[PDB]
Amino acid sequence: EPPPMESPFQREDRNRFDRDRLFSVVSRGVPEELTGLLEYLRWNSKYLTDSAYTEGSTGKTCLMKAVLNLQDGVNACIMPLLQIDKDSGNPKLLVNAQCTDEFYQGHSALHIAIEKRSLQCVKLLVENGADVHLRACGRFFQKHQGTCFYFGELPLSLAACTKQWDVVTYLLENPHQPASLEATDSLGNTVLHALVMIADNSPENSALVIHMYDGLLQMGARLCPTVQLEEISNHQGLTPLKLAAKEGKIEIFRHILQREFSGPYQPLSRKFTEWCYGPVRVSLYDLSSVDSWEKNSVLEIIAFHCKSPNRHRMVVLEPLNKLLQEKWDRLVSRFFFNFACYLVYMFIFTVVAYHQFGESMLLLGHILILLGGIYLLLGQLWYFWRRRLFIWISFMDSYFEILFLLQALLTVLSQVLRFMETEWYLPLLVLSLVLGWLNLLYYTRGFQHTGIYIQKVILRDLLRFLLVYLVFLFGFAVALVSLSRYRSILDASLELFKFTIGMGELAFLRFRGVVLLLLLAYVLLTYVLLLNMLIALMSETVNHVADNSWSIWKLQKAISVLEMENGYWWCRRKKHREGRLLKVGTPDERWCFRVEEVNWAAWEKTLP
Amino acid sequence: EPPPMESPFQREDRNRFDRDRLFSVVSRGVPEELTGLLEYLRWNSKYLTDSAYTEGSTGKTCLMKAVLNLQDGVNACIMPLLQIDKDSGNPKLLVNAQCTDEFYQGHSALHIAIEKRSLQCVKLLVENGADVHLRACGRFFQKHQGTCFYFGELPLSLAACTKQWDVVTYLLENPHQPASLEATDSLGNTVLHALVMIADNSPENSALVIHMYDGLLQMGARLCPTVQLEEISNHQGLTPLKLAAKEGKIEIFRHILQREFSGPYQPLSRKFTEWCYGPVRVSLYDLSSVDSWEKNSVLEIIAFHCKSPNRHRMVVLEPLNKLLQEKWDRLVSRFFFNFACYLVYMFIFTVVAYHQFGESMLLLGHILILLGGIYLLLGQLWYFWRRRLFIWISFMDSYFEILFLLQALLTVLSQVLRFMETEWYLPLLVLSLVLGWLNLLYYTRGFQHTGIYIQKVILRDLLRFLLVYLVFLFGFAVALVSLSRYRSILDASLELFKFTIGMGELAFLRFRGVVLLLLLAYVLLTYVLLLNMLIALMSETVNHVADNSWSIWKLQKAISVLEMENGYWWCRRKKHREGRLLKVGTPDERWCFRVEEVNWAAWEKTLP
Ligand SMILES: CCCCCCCCCC(=O)OC[C@H](COP(=O)([O-])OCCN)OC(=O)CCCCCCCCC
Ligand SMILES: CCCCCCCCCC(=O)OC[C@H](COP(=O)([O-])OCCN)OC(=O)CCCCCCCCC
Ligand SMILES: CCCCCCCCCC(=O)OC[C@H](COP(=O)([O-])OCCN)OC(=O)CCCCCCCCC
Ligand SMILES: CCCCCCCCCC(=O)OC[C@H](COP(=O)([O-])OCCN)OC(=O)CCCCCCCCC
């Protein structure tokens, strides 16, 4: 149980001028009651930073108590208190004191002064030696589930996240101690990473994050021109663009990708207008950390490292849409070659399963099946060894890989069982047959007519529905079997399930009426449960949700393209860089991608 | 890869005053750096239009580069550059230079000056000899799929499509070279055709197209009164009204049909108010190119030449609604006579099929069936030979014609098989029987009670559903047959399909549990697929779409009427002209149709 940061109704725990009198004096704003505190500390060789003058559980000092009780942004005890601190000859400054609790670790008085929105307190603390790089690494300042406020752990990041431009300006340009825009917290996050991480998809917050990000970029260009603030990576290796891509923060993501400035801040732009003709606008976009020719690119992060539901809305933005379209058009022939090879392998496997000189052809077909199963096994194992996180974070768009792996495993295990002359090779062969013929439907995503053409529901409510239904099934099965001693529990469950799915009838002997009552109860309960499932499926459709199947199709195609670009396991494909190296101003050479857009509606609004 | 029209970041390809220095001078707006260019061209016998001074891939000249880099609508290098062109004695004028690339063919500097919305540049180019009839026929200026801007290929059409009335006025009335409103592009399209072709159904764009169309009609009446601008046909034989009808541009279509002016522009009207009494308003509408007594009329184009989904919304406008109603009321007796003849032919065919002196009556019935089949065959073949495009562009409202043709073909082929004494005549006879009795439902469109009473879905998702379902069926069938060696693949597919549609049961032998598992998997997968189809059918209905079955009924009746007006194949019907010849002002005699409307809501708003 963390204690409150400031409580008007609870005294601080402890786990002549004492702590209680000092706290009561600094909480009312009268400095004249501080007379005699310095002499007591000098006589007792005491300091106003030790455990006796601070809260025992946290370490909150009298300075922090004074800043927590501001009166119109100013407290009259802060300067006298720091004067007593200076005159006492304290080796450790009171202005740079931090709490030691695991909940408020690193929290200082400058953080409180910034949070209370008082430029006077911040100015007064900086002049007396406040460190502007003190990191608040407690659990209250980390982003997790519960009561927390993550802002980047830094005073400058706290000022930027709270919309205080005057505080940011004073922290960046002061004669005493300039704050650094390149400063990082415990996670390696800069102020731009912090602005990305506090961003949700709400419009007001998006406008806030965009404004603060643009202003900090401009002031960084004005103050530290030689360094690139957007090229700094945190401990996960992510730039703010990559961090926006991973966390699904769509608005700051589209703002960073399509950032255009006119005038002195033109080098800070990532989109450069090339030429306009009527409703045709042709622009050049920066491909820095966007093109997949580097590792850990934005495309790779969106496809295989993000878990947000905004992924399909992220691949339809420019320049990502045209880039993925060009990559797909480059890889159309490779996709359908794989489809044709898989179709031939299914055809051979089907012929061999149907026909289970003729002996030689059958052996050749069997060894072709074995080699194809080994190839599909090693290909899927390579995919899982590379991308074990992708299946975990998003099962809804990667279950075909598990199906291919299962089909390859069943094929190989059926063939080795056949070589050992076990008769059970045929069931596994026909299971591989049906599984591969189902797996042929993966390649329907190559066409728009078939790729766009309940999956979210059956991955979400299937386990709960199964729980309720097998509770019903097991109870009625044990009731029917124990009344018939229907021979075994599995037989009764099978009969009830086959009747429920319409595959068979019900067998109706003493106590026939009770058996009939049990059957009526089971049938009505299953009807109610299936009606519940049917209502749950009406719930998603009738609520008028816009059609996202096209963007989901482009996400599927992006995943397919980013897999085909690496080549096969046995032969790696050479990576080719997209865009061209062009100079966009002062020599600032960037790899740019040309995107041409036609928008009649936007153009006609500009027409006078 | 077409090069950019103007790139601030890429130099032009090439596939002392040179091209690079000249381009750099004309792109900054300083003419004083042009000193010495004329002497170099005179000494080298060079011209500023050759391949050495233009872009190699396109042919873009220095003049076009100068106009592409305007500064507040004016560039100070254009007049000195044209002065050097005049003094150099160039046989071909620089002001009339065009690009030669397949993407920008015919594109000149006047087009750029109009697109940049600079009256000063247009005036300066016209005074120095710019041709106002230069046609930009490149792929960027044709309407297709991709990056393009179609405007009519002409400078006047470009000015009209971009909402520049001052530019249109200057191009039409200037002392140097007057542009012609009768000028056509490569497709024969005038400026009115171009305004129709750039029209979509959005309200702002519709208001734009209406305003420009009306202004150009008024200025054409003021400038060239003796000619009719709306009577000009392009290379497809379409007037702007017919082009609006074919392309489905509903707003400009209703504006052209119901155009009413008061005062001097009264001859430009197509709707003339005759008399008003309370909420009753009675008007006269022009029937020029609207009545079907001419060929290629608006009714013919809407019914059989348009593919837009706005066709049913086009036949409910005045005067088309009352015209089609009058034609239908004139052709009610002809429709039900055809229905009665077809009903009698079905009755005879049914009696003969049921009864497969009695021999003579059976032979007479058989030859009556044969003659009726020949008549229906030749009637449908005539329909297809006339209207092969109509079935292709709209299958949803013409499949009954294919069904009638199929029924006639099966009838004739069954009769010739019967004459050859092959026993297989009876299956084809009963197929013709059921097909004709289904085809009897075509005539339900004659009544409002039955004509208004999923078809879009089963013509759109049927192929995709069949693909997925026969993938399921074929895989489970080969798995079941290869596990039973269920005797053949077709037998197993038939059994599974019959169980799926409820027509039969499932036959359940070694490996019975694996057979059961395959059957469970197939049943659950088919349940999921049918549930997907059911959800897809909920999607259209619950989204609150307005009832368009009445307008779809009138479209069906319009198709029926426009077919009955031509008569039968053996006897052509005489065409009668609708409306009456009346003088509507200065002698301007038009064939007019009287339409009476009652609108209480519109009338009461005018009441003070
Ligand atoms: C014995 C084969 C040895 C390798 C020879 C070259 C085979 C072609 C390689 C190939 O194109 O892969 C085809 C297909 C790829 O599956 P996927 O990763 O696209 O799907 C991934 C979906 N998640 O994978 C298959 O279909 C395997 C078929 C193996 C036999 C191929 C017969 C034709 C040879 C030219
Ligand atoms: C355990 C073995 C049997 C179950 C696996 C069945 C094999 C896969 C067949 C399948 O899922 O159908 C694929 C089809 C299109 O997939 P997609 O575009 O959503 O691309 C895939 C990524 N979303 O989707 C549909 O047509 C809808 C019907 C889906 C069938 C039931 C769901 C099966 C989930 C395992
Ligand atoms: C042997 C017939 C020789 C011609 C004699 C005159 C027959 C009447 C002609 C007629 O009205 O056509 C009837 C019907 C028309 O079909 P449809 O174009 O309306 O439908 C088009 C739908 N898309 O087409 C038919 O039903 C064919 C029936 C032929 C026997 C008629 C028996 C009654 C004779 C008076
Ligand atoms: C291959 C032979 C068997 C299939 C053809 C069936 C013969 C035609 C029967 C039919 O389509 O029903 C006609 C009826 C009204 O048609 P309509 O007003 O939409 O006018 C027709 C123009 N839209 O529409 C309905 O009542 C709805 C039921 C439709 C039946 C299934 C659709 C068949 C499509 C071929």
Side-chain angles (χ1 to χ4, degrees), chain A residues 2-10 12-42 44-101 103-144 146-294 296-358 360-391 393-395 397-423 425-486 488-509 511 513-571 573 575-608, chain B residues 2-10 12-42 44-101 103-144 146-294 296-358 360-391 393-395 397-423 425-486 488-509 511 513-571 573 575-608:
Chain A
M5 194 189 291
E6 167 57 42
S7 181
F9 319 98
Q10 177 186 279
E12 300 92 1
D13 63 358
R14 281 194 154 97
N15 311 37
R16 49 178 300 176
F17 280 89
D18 288 330
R19 189 204 74 176
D20 291 357
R21 178 143 169 254
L22 179 53
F23 280 179
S24 173
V25 167
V26 302
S27 60
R28 290 187 261 100
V30 291
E32 291 292 325
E33 306 184 3
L34 292 173
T35 55
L37 167 65
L38 178 51
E39 285 76 18
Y40 183 83
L41 298 156
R42 289 182 178 274
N44 290 111
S45 69
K46 281 185 179 178
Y47 291 128
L48 72 165
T49 187
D50 308 329
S51 184
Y53 282 96
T54 63
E55 180 163 17
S57 66
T58 49
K60 169 166 91 163
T61 70
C62 47
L63 181 57
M64 294 177 70
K65 178 96 199 193
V67 185
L68 273 165
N69 291 124
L70 285 183
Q71 180 91 351
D72 277 279
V74 66
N75 190 359
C77 296
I78 297 169
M79 185 64 73
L81 202 65
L82 290 175
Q83 193 64 43
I84 308 184
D85 188 52
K86 180 190 312 172
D87 296 352
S88 69
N90 204 4
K92 47 180 74 174
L93 280 77
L94 172 72
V95 71
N96 300 332
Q98 297 172 139
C99 298
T100 62
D101 188 21
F103 198 73
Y104 301 107
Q105 193 189 4
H107 184 69
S108 65
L110 187 53
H111 283 121
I112 309 178
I114 293 170
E115 203 273 327
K116 296 272 166 293
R117 313 179 78 77
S118 178
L119 205 47
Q120 293 82 17
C121 202
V122 173
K123 281 177 177 175
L124 188 153
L125 289 170
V126 167
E127 290 157 350
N128 309 337
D131 180 15
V132 292
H133 292 100
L134 279 172
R135 277 143 65 161
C137 47
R139 207 161 38 81
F140 181 77
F141 310 106
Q142 300 150 15
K143 186 174 195 195
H144 56 79
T147 301
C148 65
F149 180 31
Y150 176 77
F151 48 80
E153 304 182 3
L154 287 167
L156 176 64
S157 302
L158 175 60
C161 292
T162 48
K163 202 187 194 315
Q164 310 175 66
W165 264 126
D166 48 321
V167 183
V168 165
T169 299
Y170 177 72
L171 287 184
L172 283 184
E173 293 179 353
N174 46 356
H176 312 307
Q177 180 143 304
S180 175
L181 280 166
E182 309 172 302
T184 64
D185 70 319
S186 296
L187 304 171
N189 280 352
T190 49
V191 67
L192 299 186
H193 295 92
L195 283 170
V196 163
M197 276 294 318
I198 68 153
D200 47 49
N201 311 299
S202 296
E204 290 272 340
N205 180 255
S206 296
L208 182 63
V209 167
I210 283 176
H211 179 60
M212 293 312 285
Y213 201 106
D214 286 350
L216 287 170
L217 273 188
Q218 293 174 356
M219 281 168 27
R222 191 176 66 187
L223 270 172
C224 46
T226 187
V227 298
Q228 288 188 319
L229 294 178
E230 285 185 323
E231 268 300 285
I232 307 178
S233 295
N234 55 349
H235 303 335
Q236 295 298 109
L238 300 185
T239 57
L241 183 48
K242 293 182 185 180
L243 189 54
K246 188 172 181 182
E247 298 303 271
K249 314 309 190 60
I250 179 67
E251 304 294 326
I252 189 64
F253 181 73
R254 68 184 68 188
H255 179 76
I256 289 176
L257 285 174
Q258 316 165 358
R259 197 172 55 219
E260 190 162 16
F261 294 123
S262 177
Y265 307 122
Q266 188 274 331
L268 293 168
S269 298
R270 279 189 76 106
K271 170 190 170 189
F272 309 97
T273 305
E274 208 180 23
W275 62 277
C276 298
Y277 203 89
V280 174
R281 302 183 60 87
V282 180
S283 296
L284 295 166
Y285 289 83
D286 212 344
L287 282 191
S288 179
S289 68
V290 176
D291 185 27
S292 60
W293 162 90
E294 293 293 328
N296 216 39
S297 63
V298 174
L299 294 178
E300 198 88 4
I301 289 167
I302 292 176
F304 310 108
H305 296 149
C306 180
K307 66 178 72 66
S308 177
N310 284 331
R311 299 190 317 142
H312 62 87
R313 298 173 61 250
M314 279 199 285
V315 293
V316 298
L317 306 180
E318 295 313 335
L320 269 54
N321 194 30
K322 185 177 180 180
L323 195 64
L324 286 164
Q325 185 58 47
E326 283 212 11
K327 288 171 172 296
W328 169 258
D329 288 358
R330 185 179 296 113
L331 292 173
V332 167
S333 55
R334 184 176 176 87
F335 187 86
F336 290 118
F337 174 76
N338 297 356
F339 167 62
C341 291
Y342 192 67
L343 193 53
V344 167
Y345 171 81
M346 293 297 103
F347 181 72
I348 297 173
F349 182 76
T350 311
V351 166
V352 168
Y354 185 100
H355 288 118
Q356 275 274 164
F357 186 57
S360 64
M361 294 299 291
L362 200 57
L363 180 64
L364 188 153
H366 277 97
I367 64 171
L368 279 192
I369 296 169
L370 183 58
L371 292 184
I374 301 299
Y375 177 100
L376 292 173
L377 195 71
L378 289 169
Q380 290 320 105
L381 285 179
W382 188 53
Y383 183 91
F384 276 82
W385 185 256
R386 289 184 290 106
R387 295 182 185 272
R388 63 181 72 90
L389 181 70
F390 175 51
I391 295 90
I393 61 182
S394 46
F395 180 84
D397 62 358
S398 54
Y399 64 91
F400 265 118
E401 299 269 10
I402 312 180
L403 290 171
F404 266 79
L405 175 68
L406 184 54
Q407 193 267 330
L409 274 162
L410 285 191
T411 299
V412 171
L413 191 153
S414 71
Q415 295 297 109
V416 54
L417 282 188
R418 183 184 147 270
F419 182 74
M420 293 177 70
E421 277 184 328
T422 300
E423 81 307 343
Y425 73 97
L426 198 70
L428 287 176
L429 210 68
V430 305
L431 285 174
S432 306
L433 193 69
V434 66
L435 195 52
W437 278 117
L438 296 179
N439 283 0
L440 202 72
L441 288 178
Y442 163 80
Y443 298 94
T444 65
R445 65 194 56 197
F447 317 96
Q448 186 161 349
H449 184 75
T450 61
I452 292 176
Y453 191 88
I454 57 191
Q455 294 179 357
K456 179 204 314 172
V457 183
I458 65 188
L459 294 180
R460 166 177 101 211
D461 284 6
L462 174 65
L463 295 190
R464 310 159 187 175
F465 179 79
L466 274 190
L467 177 62
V468 181
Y469 178 67
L470 319 166
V471 159
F472 285 8
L473 194 73
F474 176 70
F476 279 102
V478 300
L480 282 170
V481 173
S482 66
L483 206 57
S484 297
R485 296 180 177 270
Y486 302 112
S488 66
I489 301 299
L490 276 296
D491 291 331
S493 294
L494 205 71
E495 169 149 20
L496 290 173
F497 187 60
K498 282 210 272 202
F499 177 78
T500 295
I501 66 185
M503 185 179 288
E505 300 179 359
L506 280 180
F508 304 99
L509 172 65
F511 310 134
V514 187
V515 170
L516 192 47
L517 174 61
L518 289 174
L519 286 182
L520 303 190
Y522 169 80
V523 164
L524 294 166
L525 284 178
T526 50
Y527 282 176
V528 165
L529 202 61
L530 291 185
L531 198 50
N532 168 244
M533 183 278 288
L534 187 153
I535 293 297
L537 267 74
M538 293 189 179
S539 165
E540 294 293 328
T541 299
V542 309
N543 279 3
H544 317 306
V545 193
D547 50 353
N548 52 350
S549 286
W550 180 87
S551 296
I552 294 169
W553 188 35
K554 298 292 180 68
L555 187 59
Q556 270 182 357
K557 283 207 304 176
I559 294 171
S560 192
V561 161
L562 288 183
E563 284 315 286
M564 294 182 286
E565 276 201 347
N566 305 318
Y568 309 106
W569 48 294
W570 55 280
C571 171
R573 186 161 173 290
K575 288 290 177 57
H576 285 311
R577 195 161 189 178
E578 315 271 350
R580 293 179 293 173
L581 192 52
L582 295 170
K583 163 167 145 153
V584 298
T586 297
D588 173 27
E589 298 203 271
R590 304 184 186 185
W591 281 81
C592 284
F593 199 63
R594 184 174 290 109
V595 172
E596 312 157 346
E597 303 192 78
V598 180
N599 199 340
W600 279 79
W603 173 64
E604 286 191 333
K605 301 178 194 313
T606 71
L607 294 189
Chain B
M5 194 189 291
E6 167 57 42
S7 181
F9 319 98
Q10 177 186 279
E12 300 92 1
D13 62 358
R14 281 194 154 97
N15 311 37
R16 49 178 300 176
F17 280 89
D18 288 330
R19 189 204 74 176
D20 291 357
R21 178 143 169 254
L22 179 53
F23 280 179
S24 173
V25 167
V26 302
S27 60
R28 290 187 261 100
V30 291
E32 291 292 325
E33 306 184 3
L34 292 173
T35 55
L37 167 65
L38 178 51
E39 285 76 18
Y40 183 83
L41 298 156
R42 289 182 178 274
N44 290 111
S45 69
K46 281 185 179 178
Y47 291 128
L48 72 165
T49 187
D50 308 329
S51 184
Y53 282 96
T54 63
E55 180 163 17
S57 66
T58 49
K60 169 166 91 163
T61 70
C62 47
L63 181 57
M64 294 177 70
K65 178 96 199 193
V67 185
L68 273 165
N69 291 124
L70 285 183
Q71 180 91 351
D72 277 279
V74 66
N75 190 359
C77 296
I78 297 169
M79 185 64 73
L81 202 65
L82 290 175
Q83 193 64 43
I84 308 184
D85 188 52
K86 180 190 312 172
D87 296 352
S88 69
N90 204 4
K92 47 180 74 174
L93 280 77
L94 172 72
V95 71
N96 300 332
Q98 297 172 139
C99 298
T100 62
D101 188 21
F103 198 73
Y104 301 107
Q105 193 189 4
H107 184 69
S108 65
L110 187 53
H111 283 121
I112 309 178
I114 293 170
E115 203 273 327
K116 296 272 166 293
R117 313 179 78 77
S118 178
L119 205 47
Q120 293 82 17
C121 202
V122 173
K123 281 177 177 175
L124 188 153
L125 289 170
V126 167
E127 290 157 350
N128 309 337
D131 180 15
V132 292
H133 292 100
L134 279 172
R135 277 143 65 161
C137 47
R139 207 161 38 81
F140 181 77
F141 310 106
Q142 300 150 15
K143 186 174 195 195
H144 56 79
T147 301
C148 65
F149 180 31
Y150 176 77
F151 48 80
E153 304 182 3
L154 287 167
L156 176 64
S157 302
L158 175 60
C161 292
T162 48
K163 202 187 194 315
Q164 310 175 66
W165 264 126
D166 48 321
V167 183
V168 165
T169 299
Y170 177 72
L171 287 184
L172 283 184
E173 293 179 353
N174 46 356
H176 312 307
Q177 180 143 304
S180 175
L181 280 166
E182 309 172 302
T184 64
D185 70 319
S186 296
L187 304 171
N189 280 352
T190 49
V191 67
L192 299 186
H193 295 92
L195 283 170
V196 163
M197 276 294 318
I198 68 153
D200 47 49
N201 311 299
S202 296
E204 290 272 340
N205 180 255
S206 296
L208 182 63
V209 167
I210 283 176
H211 179 60
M212 293 312 285
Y213 201 106
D214 286 350
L216 287 170
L217 273 188
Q218 293 174 356
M219 281 168 27
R222 191 176 66 187
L223 270 172
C224 46
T226 187
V227 298
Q228 288 188 319
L229 294 178
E230 285 185 323
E231 268 300 285
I232 307 178
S233 295
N234 55 349
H235 303 335
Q236 295 298 109
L238 300 185
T239 57
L241 183 48
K242 293 182 185 180
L243 189 54
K246 188 172 181 182
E247 298 303 271
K249 314 309 190 60
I250 179 67
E251 304 294 326
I252 189 64
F253 181 73
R254 68 184 68 188
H255 179 76
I256 289 176
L257 285 174
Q258 316 165 358
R259 197 172 55 219
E260 190 162 16
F261 294 123
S262 177
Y265 307 122
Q266 188 274 331
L268 293 168
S269 298
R270 279 189 76 106
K271 170 190 170 189
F272 309 97
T273 305
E274 208 180 23
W275 62 277
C276 298
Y277 203 89
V280 174
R281 302 183 60 87
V282 180
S283 296
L284 295 166
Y285 289 83
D286 212 344
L287 282 191
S288 179
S289 68
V290 176
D291 185 27
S292 60
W293 162 90
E294 293 293 328
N296 216 39
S297 63
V298 174
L299 294 178
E300 198 88 4
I301 289 167
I302 292 176
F304 310 108
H305 296 149
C306 180
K307 66 178 72 66
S308 177
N310 284 331
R311 299 190 317 142
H312 62 87
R313 298 173 61 250
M314 279 199 285
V315 293
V316 298
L317 306 180
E318 295 313 335
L320 269 54
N321 194 30
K322 185 177 180 180
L323 195 64
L324 286 164
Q325 185 58 47
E326 283 212 11
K327 288 171 172 296
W328 169 258
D329 288 358
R330 185 179 296 113
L331 292 173
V332 167
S333 55
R334 184 176 176 87
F335 187 86
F336 290 118
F337 174 76
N338 297 356
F339 167 62
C341 291
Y342 192 67
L343 193 53
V344 167
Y345 171 81
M346 293 297 103
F347 181 72
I348 297 173
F349 182 76
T350 311
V351 166
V352 168
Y354 185 100
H355 288 118
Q356 275 274 164
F357 186 57
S360 64
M361 294 299 291
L362 200 57
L363 180 64
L364 188 153
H366 277 97
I367 64 171
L368 279 192
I369 296 169
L370 183 58
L371 292 184
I374 301 299
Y375 177 100
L376 292 173
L377 195 71
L378 289 169
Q380 290 320 105
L381 285 179
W382 188 53
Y383 183 91
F384 276 82
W385 185 256
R386 289 184 290 106
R387 295 182 185 272
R388 63 181 72 90
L389 181 70
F390 175 51
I391 295 90
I393 61 182
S394 46
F395 180 84
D397 62 358
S398 54
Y399 64 91
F400 265 118
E401 299 269 10
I402 312 180
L403 290 171
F404 266 79
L405 175 68
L406 184 54
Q407 193 267 330
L409 274 162
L410 285 191
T411 299
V412 171
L413 191 153
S414 71
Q415 295 297 109
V416 54
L417 282 188
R418 183 184 147 270
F419 182 74
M420 293 177 70
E421 277 184 328
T422 300
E423 81 307 343
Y425 73 97
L426 198 70
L428 287 176
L429 210 68
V430 305
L431 285 174
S432 306
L433 193 69
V434 66
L435 195 52
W437 278 117
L438 296 179
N439 283 0
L440 202 72
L441 288 178
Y442 163 80
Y443 298 94
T444 65
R445 65 194 56 197
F447 317 96
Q448 186 161 349
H449 184 75
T450 61
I452 292 176
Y453 191 88
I454 57 191
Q455 294 179 357
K456 179 204 314 172
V457 183
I458 65 188
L459 294 180
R460 166 177 101 211
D461 284 6
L462 174 65
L463 295 190
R464 310 159 187 175
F465 179 79
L466 274 190
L467 177 62
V468 181
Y469 178 67
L470 319 166
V471 159
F472 285 8
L473 194 73
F474 176 70
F476 279 102
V478 300
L480 282 170
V481 173
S482 66
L483 206 57
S484 297
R485 296 180 177 270
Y486 302 112
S488 66
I489 301 299
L490 276 296
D491 291 331
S493 294
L494 205 71
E495 169 149 20
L496 290 173
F497 187 60
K498 282 210 272 202
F499 177 78
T500 295
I501 66 185
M503 185 179 288
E505 300 179 359
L506 280 180
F508 304 99
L509 172 65
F511 310 134
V514 187
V515 170
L516 192 47
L517 174 61
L518 289 174
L519 286 182
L520 303 190
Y522 169 80
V523 164
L524 294 166
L525 284 178
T526 50
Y527 282 176
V528 165
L529 202 61
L530 291 185
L531 198 50
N532 168 244
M533 183 278 288
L534 187 153
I535 293 297
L537 267 74
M538 293 189 179
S539 165
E540 294 293 328
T541 299
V542 309
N543 279 3
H544 317 306
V545 193
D547 50 353
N548 52 350
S549 286
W550 180 87
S551 296
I552 294 169
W553 188 35
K554 298 292 180 68
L555 187 59
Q556 270 182 357
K557 283 207 304 176
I559 294 171
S560 192
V561 161
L562 288 183
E563 284 315 286
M564 294 182 286
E565 276 201 347
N566 305 318
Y568 309 106
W569 48 294
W570 55 280
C571 171
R573 186 161 173 290
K575 288 290 177 57
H576 285 311
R577 195 161 189 178
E578 315 271 350
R580 293 179 293 173
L581 192 52
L582 295 170
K583 163 167 145 153
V584 298
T586 297
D588 173 27
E589 298 203 271
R590 304 184 186 185
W591 281 81
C592 284
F593 199 63
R594 184 174 290 109
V595 172
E596 312 157 346
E597 303 192 78
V598 180
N599 199 340
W600 279 79
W603 173 64
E604 286 191 333
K605 301 178 194 313
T606 71
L607 294 189

